[PDB]
Protein: Alpha-aminoadipic semialdehyde dehydrogenase
Amino acid sequence: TLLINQPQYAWLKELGLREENEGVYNGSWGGRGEVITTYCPANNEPIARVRQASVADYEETVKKAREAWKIWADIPAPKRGEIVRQIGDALREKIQVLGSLVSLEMGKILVEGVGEVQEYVDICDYAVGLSRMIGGPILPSERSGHALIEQWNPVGLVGIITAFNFPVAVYGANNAIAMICGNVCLWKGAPTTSLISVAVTKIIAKVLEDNKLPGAICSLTCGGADIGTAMAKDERVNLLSFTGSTQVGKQVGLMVQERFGRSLLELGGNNAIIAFEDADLSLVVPSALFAAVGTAGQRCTTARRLFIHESIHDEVVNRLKKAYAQIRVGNPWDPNVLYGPLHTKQAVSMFLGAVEEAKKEGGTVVYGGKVMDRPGNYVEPTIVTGLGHDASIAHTETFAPILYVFKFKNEEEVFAWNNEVKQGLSSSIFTKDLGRIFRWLGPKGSDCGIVNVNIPTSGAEIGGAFGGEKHTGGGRESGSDAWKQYMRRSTCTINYSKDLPLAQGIKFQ
Amino acid sequence: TLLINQPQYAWLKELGLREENEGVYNGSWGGRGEVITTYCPANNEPIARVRQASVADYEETVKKAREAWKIWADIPAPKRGEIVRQIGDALREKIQVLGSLVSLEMGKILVEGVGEVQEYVDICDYAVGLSRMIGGPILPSERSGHALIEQWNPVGLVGIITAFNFPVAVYGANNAIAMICGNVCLWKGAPTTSLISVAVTKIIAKVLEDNKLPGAICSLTCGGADIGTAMAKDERVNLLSFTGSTQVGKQVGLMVQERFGRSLLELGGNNAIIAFEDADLSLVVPSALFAAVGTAGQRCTTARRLFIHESIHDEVVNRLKKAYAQIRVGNPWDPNVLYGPLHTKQAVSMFLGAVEEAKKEGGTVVYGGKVMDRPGNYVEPTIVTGLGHDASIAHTETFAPILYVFKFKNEEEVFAWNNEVKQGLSSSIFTKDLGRIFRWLGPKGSDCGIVNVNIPTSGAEIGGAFGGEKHTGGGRESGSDAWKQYMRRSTCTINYSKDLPLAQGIKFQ
Amino acid sequence: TLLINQPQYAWLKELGLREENEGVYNGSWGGRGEVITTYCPANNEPIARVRQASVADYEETVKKAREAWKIWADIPAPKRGEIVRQIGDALREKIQVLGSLVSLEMGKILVEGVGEVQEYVDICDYAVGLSRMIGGPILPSERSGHALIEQWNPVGLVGIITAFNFPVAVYGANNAIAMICGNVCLWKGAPTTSLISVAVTKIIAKVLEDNKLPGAICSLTCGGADIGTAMAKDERVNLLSFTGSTQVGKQVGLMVQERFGRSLLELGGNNAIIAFEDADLSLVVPSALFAAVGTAGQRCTTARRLFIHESIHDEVVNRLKKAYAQIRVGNPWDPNVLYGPLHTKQAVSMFLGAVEEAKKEGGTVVYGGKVMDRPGNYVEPTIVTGLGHDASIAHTETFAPILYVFKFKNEEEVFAWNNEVKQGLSSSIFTKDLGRIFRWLGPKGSDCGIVNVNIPTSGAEIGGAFGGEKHTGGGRESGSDAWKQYMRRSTCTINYSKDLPLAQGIKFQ
Amino acid sequence: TLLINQPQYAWLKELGLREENEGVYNGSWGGRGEVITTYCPANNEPIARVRQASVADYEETVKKAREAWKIWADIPAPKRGEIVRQIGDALREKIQVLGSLVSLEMGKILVEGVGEVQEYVDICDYAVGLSRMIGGPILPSERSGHALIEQWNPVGLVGIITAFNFPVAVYGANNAIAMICGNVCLWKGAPTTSLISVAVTKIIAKVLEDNKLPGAICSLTCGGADIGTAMAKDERVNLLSFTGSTQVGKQVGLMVQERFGRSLLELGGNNAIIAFEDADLSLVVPSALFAAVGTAGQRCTTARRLFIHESIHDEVVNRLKKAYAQIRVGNPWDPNVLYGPLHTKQAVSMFLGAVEEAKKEGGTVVYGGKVMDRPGNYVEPTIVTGLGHDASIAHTETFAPILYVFKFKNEEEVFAWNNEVKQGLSSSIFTKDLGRIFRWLGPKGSDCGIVNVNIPTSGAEIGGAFGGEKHTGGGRESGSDAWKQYMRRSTCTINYSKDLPLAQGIKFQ
Ligand SMILES: [Cl-]
Ligand SMILES: [Cl-]
Ligand SMILES: [Cl-]
Ligand SMILES: [Cl-]
Ligand SMILES: [Mg+2]
Structure:
């Protein structure tokens, strides 16, 4: 009954996958923990199985990774970049089958599965350039005969815990940057995307092996809360990068702080689009639709709140309704499909509960709101009007395609309503007004980590630092100087002179 | 019997101090909490009194500071820099009496009290430059017709909790940078340096008032653990900068993390000097003496571990003992005095406790070890030989002038011994060897935030970022890009084109 | 008959000026060249005399400056910054009388004379911050056991030749930055602002002398084309910063290039304001008036071309005409005056010549065009319509308040018309259109060094790099990384390892 | 008799070369100028022919390149980076045959021909990273309601004139950087490496055409001084990057300055190695040998002056002589060969002239000094002792393997002797002394653009800016912020507020 044993899924074996897969890699493959089966969310059929990490596997792997670091940190950063360049090429060679696996096991449409691998590929090439650039300034000392230099050095072992919904690119953004910065990595992906984690690790492991480097430089320990909690408490994990829910990330952040470790937290979002009276509606309507229903509403950057100026609210809602009806639903890997399943049946339950709560709280479902009657975890993309902007359910991140629509009149109030929630990931205004745009970008504007104009809430690219504020946790990935989170700064004074310190009346020899 | 009522301390009134002083400033002066008397540690005589903050004082002050922020954040950063320039000049005008007050209330020698004010003065002038420079890059977007900009904006209210031992400069470093970054400040200094906090706040208040700015931009709430804990828990404190012990800072860090605030932690040190066989001993011996006994061993950067190559260990110890015997002890304001008292009577008891534990664990006191028979909190500067490097007492920060001396043979082991403690603030090697110097600066070298060569563990200047790693807490102050900790980064994509997104087969209006 | 001998102008002595002044400073004051008398352009009366540099003076001064450099370059940059900080304070103390001298000898209104000194003061404070920041990155070498560092070091002697119209601030921007970068300076100002040059040099000389530094660090050799040509040809002048006409600057550039020196060229402008149909006309009209008539049209950044969309052309011209009639003319040191005299009688004659040329080429004088009926070099601020945008006189920089007005219809054509002249200093558009703004800032937009939006052509501040492209010469002053022009870059590889190169089959010992 | 018509050289056809090759590419291939034949310097046999550019070819190519720029500058920099990435891959695929062509037509050994292609490959990958990074800062304006941004835009057409001795990598460093900065390029290579220029252009043209981009983005006009002089005088060539002799580059620099263009000059070297008394002689002797004789002394970074402390001078010379005798001479494609021919017979004549001049100026040839009796342009690598450090011939760059050896005693004199020549490219000291190393790197140290320690004068890598000072011309290539030379800076103030300027007593409408 496993999909991997059916001839039409034989392409899975191009990624090195089998009926039962080892979920631990440290140079050798293994796994003594519980065996997990992952399921295709489009049809609820089992794909294949992964043997997860026991405690003993975790111990063995952390030790091997930290021994590997002694070799890896001695490799000049540009030569570490060459390894990352080869990882990029190795991903390129498997981009179609890896993207297909992302679609099969996670459930996003094929163009987004492929696009996720391409993002990892492109971050590799960015990191190759960074590998010749990272460092700090040489500064003019106030002391004669002294140099003053800012050095940056790897922190050591970077633990990377990732979420189900970007099962390739979040790891990749952390991996590429941590690697060129001289760190070794230990990955614990989401249990429901274990095959993706194994497949990516097979690709990287071959590059490391072909370059005669210890594979534990990019270690893997598949598991769930058990392994993740161990990483959060483990003093040997010098930096823990955690992408996931605010609820879990809060506890991870506390555990890392308890041991004076470093954490990089990429947590929940509740992202608003604001359409002012002067907005180009032919831009607003498709922008809101694709940002709200993309990935079936399961992006951290998904648009979940849409504020529309009262003068245009009804027209925008009507136009969105007509466009929602045209969304093409199907298997996520099938041609021209725009909309696939939610990742789990529990996500369907949370969807239904939020729709019910919105209705009981005075909202009107103007489109969608129901489960779809087909195999897998499909729900209708949903638009809710009439709720108060401070309704409890509107302030909650429900990881599903529910778009709460609100009216506003004035700029100051709607900026405050963007900022009033606990999350702080992405935000967008649609307007032509020059002053409003720079106020939005200013100290009295959006409080989010991503602050966009005339592009919706998923508007981000690898050249910038990606992340959020407030309960989104404060970490950054990929661009700008995000690399500094993966290294330790030292401020270094070098006395190269023959000068002696003042004796201060003491008779020294 | 208050020193401020005695003729030879009449200079205290030049700072605006009187017998009983208001310890709350938010534009108005007040203080309805407990009245604290601070004492001169050189003679245990009371100086004057300060009315501390009640809960109601704290609440009123936080609200007024956040109201002032609405005004302050709208002032262009270069004009904020002009205010910080005037603060610098106002400190210059009072540098002698303020330095004298540091010597009187805190107990460090006069040149260091004056020197502490000078560092604040110099940070002000550095911040004036920064006020025309802070910001982020404009990046090349991959998207046609889009701009990509990294913006930086103030976090809002920066709470600043400071230690007794640098009662002017730690606050000043945070104040000057936080101000040009567009933040308002709330200061809670050490209770035993309350008069210093009041005096500094009087200087700043006059500058703000002369510029017709709300005084709550630089608010003061004197108090102890009650006020500091409230700040740690207060969601209105956007960044909490904490300088203090690791024990207290750990709890502050956890409380801030619990509420997804920002913390900047500057915690304990256990700083090593390492002298290799090729070291210039005429440089090593005075360097170690002044870095170990300076400020009576009460700098966070004090040298507390001295590793000496076995070939020169006995010679260096003998030379140190002969030099320690020449240290000039007396009132810290008297001319040519090098060595004053410890800050508190509790510090004297902690000193004696550590000396006893050192003896139990196998160490030998070769110089000092006892309380001096004189008024005030004077203890002998102390040298202990023969302890194992991993002795529990050697791994502890005892904030007293106790220098633990160790032998070593090879570079790899002694670098490891530098790194093996939980603290990670400052570190120094003395050597002539070019390769050893660059290895010390590299990934297998010192793990501290300050990594020095042929200058001891207090070698730092305002152009660099100041702080440590590990249990020193990770925060940075003053130079390089430390300013970014006082601001929030946004990555901003601006679509300025008339281009519409691809319709993806949906028919839009 | 000298103004300095009349009681009405006795304040001139507060600047150390006498009836006859030494125009050479190299630590000693002297001048064996021709004695020049400078005149007040508001009343054509002689002010006082300056003894200019002979060739022997020039030779002696260059030698003393280069000897002084040996001392100055050994002073740590932050301590050089402290000298520059004190220069800023000394300027502050004389700001009113020095600004008054700028008004008296050069002729601009008092607020602009004072404002020029204030700009120098604020550049000093900027440079104080830079003095702790200048330097380059430490980069990750591809070679094991090697460091790679980018160093910056002073070029040596920076010659500074300046124009009459900013007789304080151009020198100051070069002086403050060159000084913190470790260079010594040699100033040759405009002959007609010799008293200003002497007065500034007296202020700086006292600071240097008070700090026990050789005065030749900021040397002065007053003179005309002969001294300027000598500097252009002198291999001992490592960097020649030249501010002045394109005609003279072209020759200075060729002379410096012939000897493989460095030049920093700040040459002529022909700056355009473009008002689009959507512009705020209540912003456009005052912006254009003040940018066109400010300093009697004698700024390098003066607006000389005004392109107005055809739909609003007639209205904007009518509003400009009504406002020009209200310009208040008089002695530039009187506070109601917006508008002072031109700098020379020749300038008045050239104004008249340009007006006649504009009429010959088909232009209509709609306001002004004539000399004013009063003593001093006063001309009417002048507006000319009906010329072709490619009229010869419109493409010429005439240093007089003549504003040439043109119609346009389309964005691409008017951007091209902005760009079609040989000058490339400043440019401004007035518009509300977001896309037009970013196209103006982009690769098909303005070709100038200053590219402004809704602020006119004088919109610049010290935090940015100031300068132009094309025949404006390409140099930059003040902000961003302009400091790099005053230093030499080295890319430094340091092998700190014991590794030997591969023998490649050769037998070495 | 053409090598390309012989079966042993059929591999040349892998580069698309034939008996007679078009030497003009602008999207179409042509060439109506003179047909040049290039010869193998190892045996003086003709290889193949190239049809060079006539004036009409040049004029059409410049126009086509500037038309192509309209498309290219509108492509986002990251997407321009993607093109450069594919150029790197296309070079990778041809690296062996292209390296072999460099050895055949230029004459350097095969590992260096391949290594030159590899440097271009790695610059492409570095540029891919930079394509997401280039830009300037957003700065904090002193003006309320204004933004201040530093923009960078392409200059347009970058003409690239290259020397014979790095016929791939110099072009590639300029091409990759100019391309990601949004410029189109026009290449005129050395006439004696025309086949290399054609082969590289064939590789790039295929990438451009495969991407449906106009081929004139990377245009080629093969020719000699006629085309190069036309480029130097052509106002349509916005930046002219020139690599070549100081003698030619001086005139190029003057012609570009005459038209207020931009030049990037990479001119001659006269690079010194200095061996101090404490140097590692097992490091010095091989370092000096390989840096002096590598590429038969035809690197711009070749070591030409060797200063040895008097205490070790005779020993180092004796060891160098014994090592020179082991240099393996032969065909530069033969695997066992270290030393091939000079590039031309004129180079042989210049070598002989310099050897006899050195003897006439008092030098002694202690090794070599003769032409080799064999086919091709072979001369003996040569060592000359006994010249004064200021002998005219030692101050001249003779592009041939002649090493002039000098004694010295003290550091200050030998630093001055490094600096006393007109050239300023590279420089190296060998020493263990920490203070001497930092003095060498400081303001009283080396005046060159490359300043090395314990690595010889060819020690450079792509992460750093490459170039020299003084008569080396000042330009930089490849790393750090060298990219700014290929773009134009604008300083942009944006008033986004509704604020109007102060009326200054004028009543506007
Ligand atoms: Cl001693
Ligand atoms: Cl629509
Ligand atoms: Cl040898
Ligand atoms: Cl008006
Ligand atoms: Mg003139």
About this structure: The first strand of chain B starts at residue 20 and ends at 22. Residues A 508-509; B 285, 319, 323 surround chloride ion (ligand 1) (CB under 6 Å). Residues 110-130 of chain B form the longest helix (21 residues).
